[PDB]
């Protein structure tokens, strides 16, 4: 499901194939919108976990004071609000894949607790004495510079080497503009299959888009396709049908 | 119902027409009082959802600890206070429009949960295992700088590109003062139709109002009309009948 | 479990033997990845505490505002969130070993409270009047320069001399490259025993690795073994099978 | 409990005797490890406060933002975190001795508040209107140059003359090396009484130690005894059994 | 309560009498220990404010970032930490005397805010719109050269002339050594009345003290009396009973 | 309210009349104490802004790091400490007068930002995208040599010509001693009206004062009147009742 001819994307496909059917921890690195969660889900369905659960954890969205409960579960009465006993993300991911979205935003207290769980392959729910087994395949993703964070003392070096066994780097769209035509075909095909609209781009428009910086990378490209299908339904998109900020000629 | 001759408002009318009868997510951007909820309701009644429910969500008014329940519903016993099982805003908006008022005030934990619902088109009530379908057309509104918030890590970039498919910007009143006479006619007509009073403005007063900054935009203008209909019932409003802070001459 | 022929590692083994079965406080000094926690656990299982608990404290991971509770325990209602009364790390380590990971990151307020506990061999839970006994063997570890911190006023000199009774220095991998072949054999044996893969290195690759700086020391070496077992499963690793940054020839 | 024949230590003993059973404020001056807290505790148990509490305050360890609460106590709700009403160090020291460890590290705002309490013999808890009585005997200690700090504006001159009624200076170990044999006997006796080990030093080793600079003074000397009892259990310590940095011959 | 026969102290007494029962701003100038706060309190109890509050402000002790709150009060939520609404020193001094200790250490931002309050006789709490009345009599004190500070731009000239309506200069002890015998009698009487000890000085000791420079002025003299009452309880103090640095003969 | 017969003060009165009811920027130049803020306030109450706010800015008192916030306002979270969104001096001065006290002490970074606001008549709060309108009449004051500062690169020449549209120079008191009797009458009348005292000067004292240099100009003269009303209440002030430094005869 990863479209393109660039050396970068070919490399990524080759690396995914190498690691997918192992249980090795994968760290996917790349700017927002470069397809890291797509890569994680693809890996999962081509792994030994492919018949098991795929469980995301958005490390920087969950309140720091609640993340321990979210990851590890809690027993009734463990804290204010805990009036039921509930399984956490690790328990839910057992026999499957645990996907750690933006691992660089995980608080230090949880970084160390995660590492112990990776080492011991056991955990306790918050408020519980019961040591439970876990068997999860780890996939993590980040757009941050974890090496700098280690230097800054905001990320744990021992966790880093445990997670970063098989790194996969996703190049930004601006470094692989040769794939834009193929990406657009796929985006347009999806839209048409789902009966949400139809457009196509002429070569001048494609040339213009290949000169855009794409701060939001492929997600930004997808957003443009959606928008154009409203502005010019069933239209052929030339340079003049592009929003001004996407027009790059000379 | 959007009055005026300005290029800005003509553009807005043209854009509403382009997107209304699609199910594309609309993001309405503008200062408080610029008519964003008016635009949302107008879109709804000219959409494929026009015979369905229009359900507002005030993202920054709802307590963060209760917003999950409010959006997604809850089962009996899900949390302290949950002694009944209730449908949330998403369930209530099914087959209609979900209007997200000030989306920039939605907490990060809910930003990500919202995004998953947009992606999977399914949700669970709080405390429930039952995966339910949802079919809602999304309209969101903000007076905040979401791009800056992305930079600050207070708003999710993946949610942003999912919501911001068709942006509609509402210019502040101070940037479209040519519409003030027409706006005033409409405001006065509404007041008179509802038997709440009657006034009219002379040209000197209108000139004075066109030099006002209107921090509260059209809502502030409406407030002035109401106030004047009390201070000068059935009166003709000149410069001298305006409150001091609205008097701008020379 | 400490592999190698270097004078350094022989010295370390000799020193561990001298101190393990005493209850003397041990300070282990060394860069990240030099095996300090391995040394601590080894000491524990060869100590008078070997049938007791081994309790880690990650001094720089725990929020400073929560560390007092974490170390000393708390009574119900001691602070916001304390709705149960819980034993801390000191209480949990009674009759065993308390391992202070990165003691240089412990906040000054807790440095002094720790010292009093070392002196008086008693503590109170947060919010409690009850003076409790503690009997723990202390092992601490740091990658920081505690002597400089004393000069800077960021570490307590009285605590330093109390902890630093028996220092054990771990040399960085780059200062003991003669041990790399033996380390690799052990790493590979562990991987194979655990059915996680299999590789072996030829002499040219080993020579190349002996010229690497190893910023992450032995943990970085372990990470490379894991990675290579994916890239070249059941392969013989030569210079060309090493990632570029590990290739050092001429 | 202050061992030695030096003129310095005899003087100190004579001065302690002069002031102990008065309630006069004592300032103990000396490098770290010179026994200032030992002197303070000795004074206390030979004072009119000897049946009362001895309450330490580590002025430079406590967060500046919390020191007011720590010294003076607080009422419920006084600040963020104050969900109980608690007595401070002054209240706890009533009828006894308040020991101010490193008074030179007390923040200026608290220096002045302390002085008012010394003058008025009354205080209020943080957030309270209730004026409470206090009767404490003050003993303070510093390794800093308070006279220079007065010049620098970092210590209050009015507080200085209030605290410095009876100064006691502790000479560094390097200025009283004639006491080292006696100090070592006492240190070794304590270790043996507590069943923690046994050593003794020959005259050559003692001569070598008398040429050491002792940056950590008596605490550093105590640390060496502990360390040697591990390295050479029940051994006789000669020059060769000393760590290299303590070997001083010629 | 101002003892002595010197022309200087007679002048000071005469000037205090002139200004005390007026509400004129008084600036007391003098080295540390010359009795400036004694003079301020004396003025207050012989003023029109004598039944009102005497409220000190230590301008150079209070953190600059907190001084606005300290002087003017704050409303709940005004800043980080403000979870209660509290009256400041000005509000507390209403109907009484506000004593500004070391006014030369007041930050420039607060110098100007103070001046406006002196001019307008009104203030607002931090974070508040409510303009409150204040009626305080101002007494200020400094050991600094305010005229030089004006030249340096570190003190406001407009504030200076507002505060410096009635200056009172306190001579250093070394310029009024004829008062030392009388000062000592008063100091000794206070000590004896408070049952804290008893001494008296012979004429040779008094002659010696009259040749001392007294860097700490009268406070330093008081400190010596306290110290001597410990060293020579109920003793007659001659030249030989004085500490060496106070012995001045020939 | 500007008293005197001198050609200088007559000129100043004539110039104030010329410019007051215009919105032209006024720069008032003069030594400290020459009545520049008096002139600014007088101008304001005789201007088109006379029913609007008069808002002072003390350019050299406000911390340079806070001046941007002070002038322009800030949004919540703009910087450390910004937990509320607040309007700045420009916003507060809208429809009125902004008085820039000692404009020569404004930092260069703010000089340029001020100039842009003068040019564009718009500003943004710190941390905000919202462009706001401002309509303020500018009055500035300085005792510095702005022409020299331009040469030194410490003041902006483009800002200088924008501010210096209508300069008004205030002569020092020593250059208009013919006005001293009239100034004294006014000062004494104010004091008596406010029931703060009463004095009058004989001709010999007035002659003496006319030979004084008055480094603090009229403010220093006012200070003397206040002081004399304490020293000689309801007295007639002759040469002998003047403080020595004001006595100038022969």
Coordinates of N, CA and C in Angstrom, one line a residue, chain A residues 51-227:
Chain A
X51 N -3.1 -12.1 13.0 CA -4.4 -12.5 13.4 C -4.8 -11.9 14.8
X52 N -3.9 -11.1 15.4 CA -4.1 -10.6 16.7 C -4.5 -9.1 16.6
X53 N -4.7 -8.5 17.8 CA -5.1 -7.1 17.9 C -4.0 -6.1 17.6
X54 N -4.3 -5.0 17.0 CA -3.4 -3.8 16.7 C -3.9 -2.7 17.6
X55 N -3.1 -2.4 18.7 CA -3.6 -1.4 19.7 C -2.7 -0.2 19.7
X56 N -3.2 1.0 19.3 CA -2.5 2.2 19.3 C -2.5 2.9 20.7
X57 N -1.4 3.6 21.0 CA -1.2 4.4 22.1 C -0.7 5.7 21.7
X58 N -1.5 6.8 22.0 CA -1.1 8.1 21.6 C -0.4 8.7 22.8
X59 N 0.9 8.6 22.9 CA 1.6 8.9 24.1 C 1.6 10.3 24.5
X60 N 1.4 11.2 23.5 CA 1.4 12.7 23.8 C 0.0 13.3 23.9
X61 N -1.0 12.4 23.8 CA -2.4 12.9 23.8 C -3.0 12.6 25.2
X62 N -2.6 11.4 25.7 CA -3.1 11.0 27.0 C -2.5 11.8 28.1
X63 N -3.4 12.3 29.1 CA -2.9 13.1 30.2 C -1.8 12.3 31.0
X64 N -0.7 12.9 31.4 CA 0.4 12.2 32.0 C 0.0 11.5 33.2
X65 N -1.0 12.1 34.0 CA -1.5 11.5 35.2 C -2.4 10.3 35.0
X66 N -2.8 10.0 33.7 CA -3.7 8.9 33.4 C -3.0 7.9 32.6
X67 N -1.8 8.1 32.1 CA -1.2 7.3 31.1 C -0.8 5.9 31.8
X68 N -0.5 5.9 33.0 CA -0.1 4.6 33.7 C -1.3 3.7 33.7
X69 N -2.4 4.2 34.1 CA -3.7 3.5 34.0 C -4.0 3.1 32.6
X70 N -3.9 4.0 31.6 CA -4.2 3.6 30.2 C -3.3 2.5 29.7
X71 N -2.0 2.5 30.0 CA -1.1 1.5 29.5 C -1.3 0.2 30.3
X72 N -1.4 0.3 31.6 CA -1.2 -0.9 32.5 C -2.5 -1.4 33.1
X73 N -3.6 -0.6 32.9 CA -4.9 -1.0 33.5 C -4.9 -0.6 35.0
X74 N -6.1 -0.7 35.6 CA -6.2 -0.4 37.0 C -7.2 -1.3 37.7
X75 N -7.0 -1.5 39.0 CA -8.0 -2.1 39.8 C -9.0 -1.1 40.4
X76 N -10.2 -1.5 40.7 CA -11.2 -0.7 41.3 C -10.6 0.0 42.6
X77 N -10.8 1.3 42.6 CA -10.4 2.1 43.8 C -8.9 2.5 43.8
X78 N -8.2 2.2 42.7 CA -6.8 2.5 42.6 C -6.5 4.0 42.7
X79 N -7.5 4.8 42.2 CA -7.4 6.3 42.3 C -8.7 6.9 42.2
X80 N -8.8 8.3 42.3 CA -10.0 9.0 42.2 C -10.6 8.8 40.8
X81 N -11.8 8.2 40.8 CA -12.5 7.9 39.5 C -12.5 6.4 39.2
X82 N -11.6 5.7 39.8 CA -11.6 4.2 39.5 C -12.6 3.4 40.2
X83 N -13.9 3.4 39.7 CA -14.9 2.7 40.3 C -15.2 1.3 39.6
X84 N -14.4 1.1 38.5 CA -14.4 -0.3 37.9 C -12.9 -0.7 37.7
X85 N -12.7 -2.0 37.6 CA -11.4 -2.6 37.3 C -11.3 -2.8 35.8
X86 N -10.3 -2.3 35.2 CA -10.2 -2.3 33.7 C -8.8 -2.6 33.2
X87 N -8.8 -3.4 32.0 CA -7.6 -3.8 31.4 C -7.0 -2.6 30.6
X88 N -5.7 -2.5 30.6 CA -5.0 -1.4 29.9 C -4.6 -1.8 28.5
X89 N -3.9 -0.9 27.8 CA -3.5 -1.1 26.4 C -2.5 -2.4 26.3
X90 N -1.7 -2.6 27.2 CA -0.8 -3.7 27.2 C -1.5 -5.0 27.2
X91 N -2.5 -5.1 28.2 CA -3.3 -6.3 28.3 C -4.1 -6.5 27.0
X92 N -4.7 -5.4 26.5 CA -5.5 -5.5 25.3 C -4.7 -5.9 24.1
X93 N -3.4 -5.6 24.1 CA -2.5 -5.9 22.9 C -1.9 -7.3 23.0
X94 N -2.2 -8.0 24.1 CA -1.6 -9.3 24.2 C -1.9 -10.2 23.0
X95 N -0.8 -10.9 22.6 CA -0.9 -11.7 21.4 C -0.9 -10.9 20.1
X96 N -0.8 -9.6 20.2 CA -0.8 -8.8 19.0 C 0.3 -7.7 19.0
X97 N -0.1 -6.5 18.4 CA 0.9 -5.5 18.3 C 0.5 -4.2 19.1
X98 N 1.5 -3.7 19.9 CA 1.3 -2.4 20.6 C 2.0 -1.3 19.8
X99 N 1.2 -0.4 19.3 CA 1.8 0.7 18.5 C 1.9 2.0 19.3
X100 N 3.1 2.4 19.6 CA 3.4 3.6 20.4 C 3.6 4.8 19.5
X101 N 2.5 5.6 19.3 CA 2.5 6.8 18.5 C 3.1 7.9 19.3
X102 N 4.0 8.6 18.6 CA 4.9 9.6 19.2 C 5.5 9.2 20.6
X103 N 6.4 8.3 20.5 CA 7.0 7.8 21.8 C 7.8 8.9 22.4
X104 N 8.3 9.9 21.7 CA 9.1 11.0 22.2 C 8.3 11.9 23.2
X105 N 6.9 11.7 23.1 CA 6.1 12.5 24.0 C 5.7 11.7 25.3
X106 N 6.2 10.5 25.4 CA 5.9 9.7 26.6 C 6.6 10.4 27.8
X107 N 6.0 10.6 28.9 CA 6.6 11.2 30.1 C 7.7 10.2 30.6
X108 N 8.8 10.8 31.2 CA 9.9 10.0 31.7 C 9.5 8.9 32.7
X109 N 8.6 9.2 33.7 CA 8.1 8.1 34.6 C 7.6 6.9 33.9
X110 N 6.8 7.1 32.8 CA 6.3 6.0 32.0 C 7.3 5.4 31.1
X111 N 8.3 6.2 30.7 CA 9.4 5.6 29.8 C 10.1 4.5 30.6
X112 N 10.4 4.7 31.9 CA 11.1 3.7 32.7 C 10.2 2.5 32.9
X113 N 8.9 2.7 33.2 CA 7.9 1.7 33.5 C 7.7 0.8 32.3
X114 N 7.6 1.5 31.1 CA 7.6 0.7 29.8 C 8.8 -0.2 29.7
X115 N 10.0 0.4 29.9 CA 11.2 -0.4 29.7 C 11.2 -1.6 30.6
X116 N 10.8 -1.5 31.8 CA 10.8 -2.7 32.7 C 9.9 -3.8 32.2
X117 N 8.8 -3.3 31.6 CA 7.8 -4.3 31.1 C 8.4 -5.0 29.8
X118 N 9.1 -4.2 29.0 CA 9.8 -4.8 27.9 C 10.9 -5.8 28.4
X119 N 11.6 -5.5 29.5 CA 12.6 -6.4 30.0 C 12.0 -7.6 30.7
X120 N 11.0 -7.4 31.5 CA 10.5 -8.5 32.4 C 9.4 -9.3 31.7
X121 N 8.7 -8.7 30.7 CA 7.6 -9.2 30.0 C 6.4 -9.5 31.0
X122 N 6.4 -8.7 32.0 CA 5.3 -8.8 33.0 C 4.9 -7.3 33.4
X123 N 3.7 -7.2 33.9 CA 3.2 -5.9 34.4 C 2.2 -6.2 35.5
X124 N 1.9 -5.1 36.3 CA 0.8 -5.1 37.2 C -0.1 -4.0 36.9
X125 N -1.4 -4.2 37.0 CA -2.4 -3.1 36.9 C -2.2 -2.1 38.0
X126 N -2.5 -0.8 37.8 CA -2.4 0.2 38.9 C -3.2 -0.3 40.1
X127 N -2.6 -0.3 41.3 CA -3.3 -0.7 42.5 C -3.4 -2.2 42.7
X128 N -2.7 -2.9 41.9 CA -2.7 -4.4 42.0 C -1.4 -5.0 42.3
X129 N -1.5 -6.2 43.0 CA -0.3 -7.0 43.3 C -0.1 -8.0 42.3
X130 N -1.1 -8.3 41.5 CA -1.1 -9.5 40.6 C -0.1 -9.2 39.4
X131 N 0.9 -9.9 39.3 CA 1.8 -9.8 38.2 C 1.3 -10.6 37.0
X132 N 1.0 -9.9 35.9 CA 0.5 -10.5 34.7 C 1.5 -10.6 33.6
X133 N 1.4 -11.6 32.8 CA 2.2 -11.8 31.6 C 1.8 -10.9 30.5
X134 N 2.7 -10.4 29.7 CA 2.4 -9.8 28.4 C 3.3 -10.3 27.3
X135 N 2.7 -10.5 26.1 CA 3.4 -10.8 24.9 C 2.9 -9.9 23.8
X136 N 3.6 -8.8 23.6 CA 3.2 -7.9 22.5 C 4.4 -7.7 21.6
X137 N 4.1 -7.4 20.3 CA 5.2 -7.0 19.4 C 5.2 -5.5 19.4
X138 N 6.3 -4.8 19.6 CA 6.3 -3.4 19.7 C 6.6 -2.7 18.4
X139 N 5.8 -1.8 18.0 CA 6.1 -0.8 17.0 C 6.0 0.6 17.5
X140 N 7.0 1.4 17.4 CA 6.9 2.8 17.9 C 7.2 3.8 16.7
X141 N 6.7 5.0 16.9 CA 6.9 6.0 15.9 C 7.2 7.4 16.5
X142 N 8.0 8.2 15.8 CA 8.3 9.5 16.3 C 8.7 10.5 15.2
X143 N 8.4 11.7 15.4 CA 8.9 12.8 14.5 C 9.9 13.6 15.2
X144 N 10.3 13.2 16.4 CA 11.2 13.9 17.2 C 12.7 13.4 17.1
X145 N 13.6 14.2 17.6 CA 15.0 13.8 17.6 C 15.3 13.1 18.9
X146 N 15.2 11.8 19.0 CA 15.3 11.1 20.3 C 16.8 11.2 20.8
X147 N 17.7 11.2 19.9 CA 19.1 11.4 20.3 C 19.4 12.7 21.1
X148 N 18.8 13.8 20.6 CA 18.9 15.0 21.3 C 18.2 15.0 22.6
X149 N 17.1 14.3 22.6 CA 16.3 14.2 23.9 C 17.1 13.5 24.9
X150 N 17.8 12.4 24.5 CA 18.7 11.7 25.4 C 19.7 12.7 26.0
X151 N 20.3 13.5 25.1 CA 21.3 14.5 25.6 C 20.7 15.5 26.5
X152 N 19.4 15.8 26.3 CA 18.7 16.8 27.1 C 18.1 16.2 28.4
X153 N 18.2 14.8 28.5 CA 17.7 14.2 29.7 C 16.2 14.0 29.6
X154 N 15.6 14.2 28.5 CA 14.1 14.1 28.3 C 13.7 12.8 27.7
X155 N 14.6 11.9 27.3 CA 14.3 10.6 26.9 C 15.4 9.6 27.4
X156 N 15.0 8.4 27.8 CA 15.9 7.4 28.4 C 16.7 6.7 27.3
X157 N 18.0 6.7 27.5 CA 18.9 6.0 26.6 C 18.7 4.5 26.6
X158 N 18.5 3.9 27.8 CA 18.2 2.5 27.9 C 16.9 2.1 27.2
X159 N 15.9 2.9 27.3 CA 14.7 2.6 26.5 C 14.9 2.8 25.0
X160 N 15.7 3.8 24.6 CA 16.0 4.0 23.2 C 16.6 2.8 22.5
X161 N 17.6 2.2 23.2 CA 18.3 1.1 22.5 C 17.4 -0.2 22.5
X162 N 16.5 -0.2 23.5 CA 15.5 -1.3 23.5 C 14.5 -1.2 22.4
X163 N 14.1 0.0 22.1 CA 13.0 0.2 21.1 C 13.6 0.3 19.7
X164 N 14.8 0.9 19.6 CA 15.4 1.2 18.3 C 16.2 0.0 17.7
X165 N 15.6 -1.2 17.7 CA 16.3 -2.4 17.2 C 16.3 -2.3 15.7
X166 N 15.2 -2.0 15.1 CA 15.1 -1.9 13.6 C 14.5 -0.6 13.2
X167 N 15.3 0.4 12.9 CA 14.7 1.7 12.6 C 14.3 1.8 11.1
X168 N 13.2 2.5 10.8 CA 12.8 2.7 9.5 C 12.5 4.2 9.3
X169 N 13.3 4.8 8.5 CA 13.1 6.3 8.2 C 12.2 6.6 7.0
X170 N 11.2 7.4 7.2 CA 10.3 7.8 6.2 C 10.8 9.2 5.7
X171 N 11.2 9.3 4.4 CA 11.6 10.6 3.8 C 10.4 11.5 3.7
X172 N 10.6 12.8 3.9 CA 9.5 13.8 3.6 C 9.1 13.8 2.2
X173 N 7.9 14.2 1.9 CA 7.4 14.3 0.5 C 8.3 15.1 -0.4
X174 N 8.9 16.2 0.2 CA 9.7 17.1 -0.6 C 11.0 16.5 -1.1
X175 N 11.4 15.4 -0.4 CA 12.6 14.6 -0.8 C 12.3 13.4 -1.7
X176 N 11.0 13.3 -2.1 CA 10.7 12.2 -3.0 C 9.5 12.6 -4.0
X177 N 9.7 13.8 -4.5 CA 8.6 14.4 -5.4 C 8.3 13.5 -6.6
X178 N 9.3 12.6 -6.9 CA 9.0 11.8 -8.1 C 7.8 10.8 -7.9
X179 N 7.4 10.6 -6.6 CA 6.3 9.8 -6.3 C 5.0 10.5 -6.3
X180 N 4.9 11.8 -6.5 CA 3.7 12.5 -6.3 C 2.6 12.1 -7.3
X181 N 3.0 11.8 -8.6 CA 2.0 11.4 -9.6 C 1.3 10.1 -9.2
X182 N 2.2 9.1 -8.8 CA 1.7 7.8 -8.3 C 0.8 7.9 -7.0
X183 N 1.3 8.8 -6.1 CA 0.5 9.0 -4.8 C -0.9 9.6 -5.2
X184 N -0.9 10.6 -6.1 CA -2.1 11.2 -6.5 C -3.1 10.2 -7.2
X185 N -2.5 9.3 -8.0 CA -3.4 8.3 -8.6 C -4.1 7.4 -7.5
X186 N -3.3 7.1 -6.5 CA -3.8 6.2 -5.5 C -4.9 7.0 -4.6
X187 N -4.6 8.2 -4.3 CA -5.5 9.1 -3.6 C -6.8 9.2 -4.3
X188 N -6.7 9.5 -5.6 CA -7.9 9.7 -6.5 C -8.7 8.4 -6.6
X189 N -7.9 7.3 -6.8 CA -8.6 6.0 -6.9 C -9.4 5.7 -5.6
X190 N -8.9 6.0 -4.4 CA -9.6 5.7 -3.2 C -10.8 6.6 -3.1
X191 N -10.7 7.9 -3.5 CA -11.8 8.8 -3.4 C -13.0 8.3 -4.3
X192 N -12.6 7.9 -5.5 CA -13.6 7.4 -6.5 C -14.2 6.1 -6.2
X193 N -13.4 5.2 -5.6 CA -14.0 3.9 -5.1 C -15.0 4.2 -4.0
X194 N -14.7 5.1 -3.2 CA -15.6 5.5 -2.1 C -16.7 6.5 -2.5
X195 N -16.8 6.7 -3.8 CA -17.8 7.6 -4.3 C -17.8 9.0 -3.7
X196 N -16.7 9.6 -3.4 CA -16.6 10.9 -2.7 C -16.1 12.0 -3.7
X197 N -16.0 11.7 -5.0 CA -15.6 12.7 -5.9 C -14.6 12.1 -6.9
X198 N -14.2 13.0 -7.9 CA -13.3 12.5 -8.9 C -12.6 13.8 -9.5
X199 N -11.3 13.7 -9.7 CA -10.6 14.7 -10.4 C -9.4 14.0 -11.1
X200 N -8.7 14.8 -11.9 CA -7.3 14.3 -12.3 C -6.5 15.5 -12.6
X201 N -5.2 15.4 -12.5 CA -4.3 16.5 -12.7 C -3.6 16.5 -14.0
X202 N -3.4 17.6 -14.6 CA -2.6 17.6 -15.9 C -1.1 17.8 -15.5
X203 N -0.2 17.7 -16.5 CA 1.2 17.6 -16.2 C 1.7 18.9 -15.6
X204 N 1.2 20.0 -16.0 CA 1.6 21.3 -15.5 C 1.3 21.4 -14.0
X205 N 0.1 21.0 -13.6 CA -0.2 21.0 -12.2 C 0.7 20.1 -11.4
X206 N 1.0 18.9 -12.0 CA 1.9 17.9 -11.3 C 3.3 18.6 -11.1
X207 N 3.8 19.2 -12.2 CA 5.1 19.9 -12.1 C 5.1 20.9 -11.0
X208 N 4.0 21.7 -10.9 CA 3.8 22.7 -9.9 C 3.9 22.1 -8.5
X209 N 3.1 21.0 -8.3 CA 3.1 20.3 -7.0 C 4.4 19.8 -6.6
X210 N 5.2 19.4 -7.6 CA 6.6 18.8 -7.3 C 7.5 19.9 -6.8
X211 N 7.1 21.2 -6.9 CA 8.0 22.2 -6.4 C 7.5 22.8 -5.1
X212 N 6.4 22.2 -4.5 CA 5.8 22.6 -3.2 C 6.6 21.9 -2.1
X213 N 6.7 22.5 -1.0 CA 7.5 22.0 0.2 C 6.8 21.0 1.0
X214 N 5.5 20.9 0.9 CA 4.6 19.9 1.6 C 5.0 19.8 3.1
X215 N 4.7 20.9 3.9 CA 5.0 20.8 5.3 C 4.2 19.7 6.0
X216 N 3.0 19.3 5.5 CA 2.2 18.2 6.0 C 2.4 16.9 5.2
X217 N 3.3 16.9 4.3 CA 3.7 15.7 3.6 C 2.5 15.0 2.9
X218 N 2.4 13.7 3.0 CA 1.3 13.0 2.2 C -0.1 13.3 2.7
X219 N -0.2 13.5 4.0 CA -1.5 13.9 4.5 C -2.0 15.2 3.9
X220 N -1.1 16.1 3.8 CA -1.4 17.4 3.2 C -1.8 17.3 1.7
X221 N -1.1 16.4 1.0 CA -1.4 16.0 -0.4 C -2.8 15.4 -0.5
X222 N -3.2 14.6 0.4 CA -4.5 13.9 0.5 C -5.6 15.0 0.7
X223 N -5.3 15.9 1.6 CA -6.2 17.0 1.9 C -6.4 17.9 0.7
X224 N -5.4 18.1 -0.1 CA -5.6 18.9 -1.3 C -6.5 18.2 -2.3
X225 N -6.3 16.9 -2.5 CA -7.1 16.1 -3.4 C -8.6 16.3 -3.0
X226 N -8.9 16.1 -1.7 CA -10.3 16.2 -1.2 C -10.8 17.6 -1.5
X227 N -10.1 18.6 -1.2 CA -10.5 20.0 -1.4 C -10.8 20.3 -2.9

